[PDB]
Design a protein around this ligand. Structure first.
Ligand SMILES: Nc1nc2c(ncn2[C@@H]2O[C@H](COP(=O)(O)OP(=O)(O)O)[C@@H](OP(=O)(O)OP(=O)(O)O)[C@H]2O)c(=O)[nH]1
Ligand SMILES: [Mg+2]
Ligand SMILES: [Mg+2]
Lengths: 495, 494, 498, 498
């Protein structure tokens, strides 16, 4: 998911829309924008789809005001396509709205405590609504008016003690202003920027990725620190404050491998350069362990892996060629009455340039292997194009555990690397050879760009969950969320 | 506006939709339906437009569950076309949603108290959102779970003491059930019905008008009494309770004149038969005061007045003829870059039968006169059709004061009767004669069908507001709403 | 169906839209408008639904120009809801568009001929597309340009020979102007009107009914004559000419009974007055035949029959009461997975005022009886409302044969009056009594407003088709059109359930 | 624009859609699909927007049949976003529909001829409707039925003699089948493929580019030849014929430079390899003429130039770095009452990786320079990202003349290179240095993948127009279309705002 907040001095509706279009890669399922207008009321538009489809001229006319937040949704367990999008808001106390990228690992417990202790109903299965209601609960403890910055930071601190998981959040409180804050492990990304208007007026903004600030001409200030909160008043004063105990920086490694845009800087690390370093490390691993293999050409599975595969080819002294082309535009496969049922095909996303495979031993490079269904189909496409041997190298280590921090993944049983060794994975997918980045090399490739990061969030790779509350029990509460998601999606199709 | 609530034993989405389609005359601007599904979550669809345009197949699939409420909106000051429709809901305490037909005369004070004492923000200018938050605030006082019927009625009693105005309300509380309640002066209409499914299972419903029960095959039980509350649990038990001090029945006169459907029975009065009575009284008054006039034909302004004009013609011993035909379908006027300026016409709503006016002294009958714009244009249509003399009779008395109880009216300065006598109105609208029902006759015509009603809500006619809190100051706070209503609409078209 | 054409000196899009809205009762399934813009090109918008939903502001900006035509469709066979609507157009010769209310009875023969002699393909099952292509092929025989009015009139005469059935039509020819014409037996209605803008410029319009002239402030000129053709040039001159051999006036009778609006005048006959007379004729017949029956009240089945039942209640010297209320708003029923309807379909349409039926012998009045299922259920409503005895009177004669002149009718097999006698019909539907209007009485009621009309189109009542082309083969052709129209409608709903 | 035609033995709707999606880069303004269903009726769905927006579930149940064509529109003059999209059809003779990538240079003459000699009205300004009518005209001379292959090819040859310009067409004729043909200079791309379903039933398809064959699993047969016509019958038989005298292969160079997809093979030439070769020639030219310049890094303007820049960086022994990222999603700007944009035009399209420019002399590589306002703003971006010297290299020669053969382009007075030398362009756009591909190097680079091609369509670079009818009368005719296209688009926006 992606989030943005703009505390401006002139209308923000178009700017938030623009920032969301450059964060659109963080989630295409739904989008929402909410502003505070001159009457101190929330104006909202959200709906399924891409940003450019969700917001029409009439909705922009509605989204009046100089402060607002936006969200793009990647479907995750509990927040399925069939469900209500973000942002959510509550009318009490004061009027609060929140958007968030991440996942709460104690959602279930929090729901119960909200009900039993506060009689606060949660109407969806989105942990974002839970998070909003905890925050609102802590804000409701104050009697005096207005709230002071210390009251707001105290409720954020309280929230951080109650909730666990990973989160970057932006929120607004009517009559007060905009807050943003980050989980105490710095897992999910969040940056702060500013745009000077004149001697007395500065605008501020926060976003998941720095490209959102770039595209609007905001000056990058810094990453929001692990556990830190920001509060920008309606009058434009900036406050900051640490609101977690023992904050530490454990950035998500998947942002660098695949999820974020290459022109972003996350926790001082250029995503582009991290990815080039991944290619260096994997190229060096291939040169040492596959010295005996006959490789004619190195071919990326676009788009993420193009620069990774270029660096591998360079280390190996081998030609780089664009043997695959990704269709910029993908369409739906309709269900006509009867007729051909053809579906679940990878040619809808990729086309092979036949001349780049014919009678060649090809080294394919992908960013990751998840279910392995897609890589099996890619290998077959390469053989149909005339490849002799097909080798596959993964920029990411083996993906063996589910991500419960906001990156959507199948359960452990649908991960091909779960319970299996490289050579077994190789035989299932039909490759003549298969090699994965080593985790310590992936870690080193990213630390190279900021050696101050001592540990990353690696759970999908090694099963170490830094929030220490993930057990097989909890993994089964998540399957009963994915079960209900798929029924809600399913009952929309019947329509 | 119109409301409906159904506490069923099987899915209610289609039934609520069907009920709203037969209450659609109570408001065409917007529609909303909300249900409670099997997961004890609210499912909502609301939007601008007619019921048939608001709810499509994908929305009905969403609206799961066996309990639900619906609303159709008539644009009113505070709840403009451009604004959020009903129903509203809040997630705390418990999860509450409400729909309402009426208006709160102390909305302004209530909003302030909600903010200062409860930190409860109101995001729209709809008094129904305020009403919901007052109710939620009183429900929030209880700690034990679940609430008992007694707690709910107590929070309603507390709400009635805080709010003033007119209201028929239906609401749902997650984990509990459906409530309905009516203001202590019984101004806005509300009826209760039931449908037996078997020996242990009965469904209940409430609606603004009895025709909603009829169309779904619910047995009519009774009007909800002034100040009464109804609570139907999720398991199908009905409780009732008086929740106001000194309740009294002052039904809105306007429902009988024009607003309700003729096949409804409100507080035991057939609307159709009240309207025939209005015809009897006005025809008699015409026979007495206009004895010397040459009248050739009696022509109603359709559709409300058709049965009224019939009774008038029968008293006068004069022929009834359908001189005007109401276009069942009306369309928009479009703004094109080179566009024409002729929007104002009433020919877009009405067509004259030329043969029925040529060389005749015509007595036209309409249900009411508000701005007089439409009347002037209707009289002119009769003259263009060939009429010689044109007389106009109004089933309702002179409309001189704004309605602040849920019937949308213009401000007193846009009311043509405001500050004017009959003959002066007559000459503005271009008529050769003008006559109004007497208020006491209108009252007698409706009271004939239920003599138990001592006093009606008559404020549009005589300026007597039964809630005793309407002063020129409050009339100004309403102009500030209509001021902001129009700014929202100008922003949409633009 | 209903049709409008306006030859104006100023933009026509809004005016046509408003004319279609007051003709909307003639067909609610589809609508279309086509204009000729200032570049001499057609601009078109047509689609399923009501006029108010079909035409949005984006479609209306496109419909530029001072001349255009409009159509609203009533759904039939060969012109189903799921099919392409009117108007249709062809770009050769010259550029022609046409809109028609009616039905050709030699449609099959005409399609074959168009294919064989002119290699003209017909893409739809709409007879109006066939009619348009005949007219196009007749205009294609002239070399010189521009066409003269004589040419255009010739082409229309040649068309009248070729085709058979009932038709009112309006068409436009790019570079020339607007035409309208009526079938040679004047079955389908069509009127002409004018509107003076100044001494030099006059606008003209034609419409299915006069209320469309009225609503736009056009002065009525006359009904178009059977077989007559109107031609209005782009420069605003009105030409006319008889284009049929043997033109006679046989206006359709169902227009008067319930299809037209009461405030229209069709061939000099007031629909409203026609209908009051029908109440007179039928109330007399009731008093004579049902002298011995105890009628408490006359209750109409709204809305067409309210004025009919009023007159009947007068003749019978009995009270009239609004015992039924037609629901102004009927919604869609949703095909809902595993759900049950609480709502009887008769209640979708009507509601009963309980107090007006309770413990009374009631005489219900309806405008007609087609399938009898509907009639049966209305009677049932009265009983559960409290009525003791329930009598039913029908303002029209028994309906026994289908209309093939433009009025969508079920097949004879479905008409409850086919092969059945009146006391038979009564037993099925459940009436304690049933009576019909006599065709001769119905005819008297209508001729009384214009004795110059000697014969009416009465086929639905008596089986006599003025075109003489109606046989069991053509009826089977119209039923293979129904099946395919119903198979195409079914396919839209299979796939519109994702 | 891009075109598809599939002549199959099972439903083609989804296949045609899938193929248009992989040709979607050839035009995103509008899309149309039309099929011949079981009753030899055309079935159509066309509208503005992307393929995935245009065709909903409801439109695809409608598009029944085993034969069909498709089109995606790149917005040009006379075929604007606010205009009716392709495909068009006519219903005489027989029923014909056609889809076209190209442009007729004698469109005005051909409309005159169609009107005077045939009385065929052309309702839009799309030259595709004119081409369809000319062909329909030539097909109507043949009177006996059915048409024979030789009749159809005769019609196509007659059409090629009448029309001038550039075209790739696919068309269908009801009752007969599908044809496809190519202008006699082979300017616009068109390939042919097949898919064997057993030893009796082969499906065929044509398309603008081979990737559409690939994505559906059709084996590639060959490029349709310059002036050649293909005809595929309803039974499944493939015939061909040369239908021009003096056919010659002059393929569009712009397809190779950037318009086509790299994974396509156009006249036996891999677009990918041609673009690598373009970077080789350009890196060589730079190594020679800029020997003395200090280049830190080569940075492509994505996406088309990434492979070109990689090869240049190779030739120069300098680092290649992704300093610019193209924004995959662009979104609309709303006409905003009293509002100030915070977003520069150039930032909607591109974003700068600041770390890749800071304190470096950078060589930017782009596929072309047209107006140069864009290029100026990209150079400014690099400077604000922190670059010292900013050099710019264009994979294409100077663009000096308008393309009149189907690639939308501005008029010559709008082209920055028109009437100017390299150093003047450099100073205007604000580059420290500027260098263009030499035209002979471009020709060599593309030729090296197939030396059988002697000459290319180069008009935009050198003014040589191969069809020899591009006068000021036609260039004025085009600027008249653009003026009216603008007025129509402006009217749509005003009506929406209002
Ligand atoms: N630019 C342009 N577009 C035209 C013109 N004429 C029609 N169209 C558009 O193409 C579509 C025409 O197809 P329709 O007649 O609507 O038929 P269909 O919806 O059953 O496919 C419409 O888009 P749609 O997606 O179906 O939307 P809607 O307008 O029907 O709601 C309409 O807006 C024209 O002259 N110029
Ligand atoms: Mg909506
Ligand atoms: Mg459409």
């Amino acid at each position: 998911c992606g989030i943005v907040g703009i505390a401006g001095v002139m209308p923000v509706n178009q700017s938030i829309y623009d920032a969301l279009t450059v964060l659109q890669h963080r989630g295409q399922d739904a989008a929402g924008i909410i502003t505070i207008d001159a009457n101190n009321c929330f104006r909202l538009r959200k709906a399924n789809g891409l940003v450019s489809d969700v917001f029409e001229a009439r909705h922009m006319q509605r989204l009046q005001g100089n402060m607002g937040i936006g969200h793009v949704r990647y479907p995750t367990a509990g927040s399925s396509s069939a469900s209500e999008a973000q942002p959510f808001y509550v009318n009490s106390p004061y009027g609060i709205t929140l958007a968030h990228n991440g996942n709460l690992t104690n959602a279930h417990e929090l729901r119960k405590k909200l009900f039993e202790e506060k009689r606060r109903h949660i109407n969806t299965t989105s942990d974002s609504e839970i998070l909003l209601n905890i925050f609102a609960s802590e804000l409701d403890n104050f009697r005096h008016y207005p709230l002071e910055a210390d009251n707001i930071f105290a409720a954020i601190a309280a929230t951080n003690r109650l909730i666990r998981g990973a989160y970057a959040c932006v929120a607004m409180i009517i009559g007060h202003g905009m807050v943003a804050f980050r989980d105490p492990n710095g897992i999910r990304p969040l940056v702060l920027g500013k745009r000077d208007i004149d001697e007395n007026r500065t605008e501020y903004m926060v976003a998941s990725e720095s490209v959102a600030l770039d595209t609007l001409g905001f000056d990058f200030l810094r990453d929001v620190a692990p556990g830190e909160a920001i509060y920008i008043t309606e009058e434009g004063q900036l406050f900051t404050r640490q609101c977690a105990d023992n904050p530490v920086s454990n950035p998500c490694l998947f942002e660098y491998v695949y999820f974020a845009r290459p022109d972003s800087f996350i926790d001082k690390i250029s995503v582009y350069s991290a990815r080039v370093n991944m290619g260096t490390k994997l190229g060096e691993k291939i040169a040492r362990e596959w010295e005996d293999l006959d490789i004619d050409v190195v071919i990326p599975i676009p788009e993420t892996s193009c620069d990774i595969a270029l660096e591998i080819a360079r280390i190996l002294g081998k030609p780089y060629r664009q043997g695959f082309v990704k269709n910029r535009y993908v369409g739906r496969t309709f269900i006509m009455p009867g007729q051909q049922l053809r579906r679940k095909s990878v040619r809808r996303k990729l086309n092979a340039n036949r001349a780049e495979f014919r009678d060649k031993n090809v080294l394919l490079v992908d960013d990751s292997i998840v279910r392995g269904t897609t890589s099996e189909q890619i290998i077959e496409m390469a053989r149909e194009a005339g490849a002799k041997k097909v080798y596959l190298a993964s920029a990411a280590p083996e993906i063996r555990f589910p991500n419960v921090y906001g990156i959507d993944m199948p359960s452990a049983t649908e991960l091909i690397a779960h319970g299996r060794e490289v050579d077994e994975i190789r035989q299932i997918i039909g490759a003549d050879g298969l090699i994965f980045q080593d985790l310590n090399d992936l870690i080193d490739a990213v630390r190279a760009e900021n050696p101050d990061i001592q540990q990353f969030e690696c759970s999908v790779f090694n099963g170490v969950y830094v929030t220490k509350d993930v057990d097989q029990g909890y993994l089964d509460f998540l399957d009963t969320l994915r079960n209900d998601d798929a029924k809600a999606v399913q009952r929309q199709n019947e329509v």
